[PDB]
Design a protein around this ligand. Structure first.
Ligand SMILES: COc1cccc(OCc2cc(C)ccn2)c1-c1ccc2c(c1)CCNCC2
Ligand SMILES: [Br-]
Ligand SMILES: [Br-]
Ligand SMILES: [Br-]
Length: 268
């Protein structure tokens, strides 16, 4: 079940770092080829079983997903540290990529956000809620191929329920029902997707610039929304506003969102 540490070779440099530990590039020896991998290495210096459980829960979610627009997990490796081994998205986070590549065309942005919506449509069908959907968690394989990453806050909904009730955030990406009722659904992921669209069409600018979480909640309760980014097609801004529908019951699901993007990409 677990991967063989002797078949894994890691680079010295870190791709990124956090409280969890590090993400490093590596190579996993397969039957005859070697596969480039991104390895999330758990820094659990104090042997906290909570942090261990968090990595294992993330791995448990990823093992159940199989879609071209979601980062694939290769396996877990129990070695010097606990390691989650994943396919490599070489070009990195979408927000950083667009910050450094402002020549990327509107049509290319639509292509990438449509791919994200196809991954999310699959997640919604599979009854998983992501709970951390943001441009920073969309990774590029190529300039024309995006994948959803970072399932650490994700929840597998029970067969008889439509939402997850929290006990606790990236408030700028959260729907009002998340803040007011602590309820997370595929519809709250749609709200987040609207913020992600705004980020992408803004070439990786931060949403609600300079504002505190409390100020964002107040703005939204007044019915105010972020504006149309420079160069963003009206039809895409209209879709962003639909994702930011206040009442969860009237907000679209990912089937509707993906269809709108699909039609706009291919028909226009
Ligand atoms: C400047 O950052 C990068 C630059 C290039 C590649 C990167 O990773 C390639 C990757 C990562 C993973 C988890 C799976 C598959 N491929 C990253 C990078 C570094 C840290 C994190 C990520 C991305 C995801 C976002 N969450 C924080 C953790
Ligand atoms: Br090594
Ligand atoms: Br961010
Ligand atoms: Br935030």
């Amino acid at each position: 079940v677990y991967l063989d540490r002797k078949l894994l070779t890691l680079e010295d440099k870190e791709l990124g770092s956090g409280n969890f530990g590090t993400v490093k590039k590596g190579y996993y020896q397969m039957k005859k080829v070697v596969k480039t991998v991104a390895v999330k290495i758990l820094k659990n210096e104090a042997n906290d079983p909570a942090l261990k459980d968090e990595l294992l829960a993330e791995a448990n979610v990823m093992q159940q997903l199989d879609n071209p627009y979601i980062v694939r997990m290769i396996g877990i490796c129990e070695a010097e540290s606990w390691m989650l081994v994943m396919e490599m998205a070489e070009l990195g986070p979408l927000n950083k990529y667009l910050q450094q590549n402002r020549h990327v065309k509107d049509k290319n942005i639509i292509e990438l956000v449509h791919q994200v919506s196809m991954g999310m449509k699959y997640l919604e069908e599979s009854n998983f809620v992501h709970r951390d959907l943001a441009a920073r968690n969309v990774l590029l394989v190529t300039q024309h191929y995006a994948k959803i990453s970072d399932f650490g806050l994700s929840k597998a909904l029970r067969a008889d329920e439509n939402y997850y009730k929290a006990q606790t955030w990236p408030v700028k990406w959260y729907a009002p029902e998340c803040i007011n009722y602590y309820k997370f659904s595929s519809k709250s992921d749609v709200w987040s997707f609207g913020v992600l669209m705004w980020e992408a069409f803004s070439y990786g600018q931060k949403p609600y610039r300079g504002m505190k979480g409390s100020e964002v909640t107040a703005m939204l309760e007044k019915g105010e929304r972020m504006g149309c980014p420079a160069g963003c097609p009206r039809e895409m801004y209209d879709l962003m506003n639909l994702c930011w529908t206040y009442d969860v019951e009237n907000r679209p699901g990912f089937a509707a969102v993906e269809l709108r993007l699909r039609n706009y990409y291919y028909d226009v």
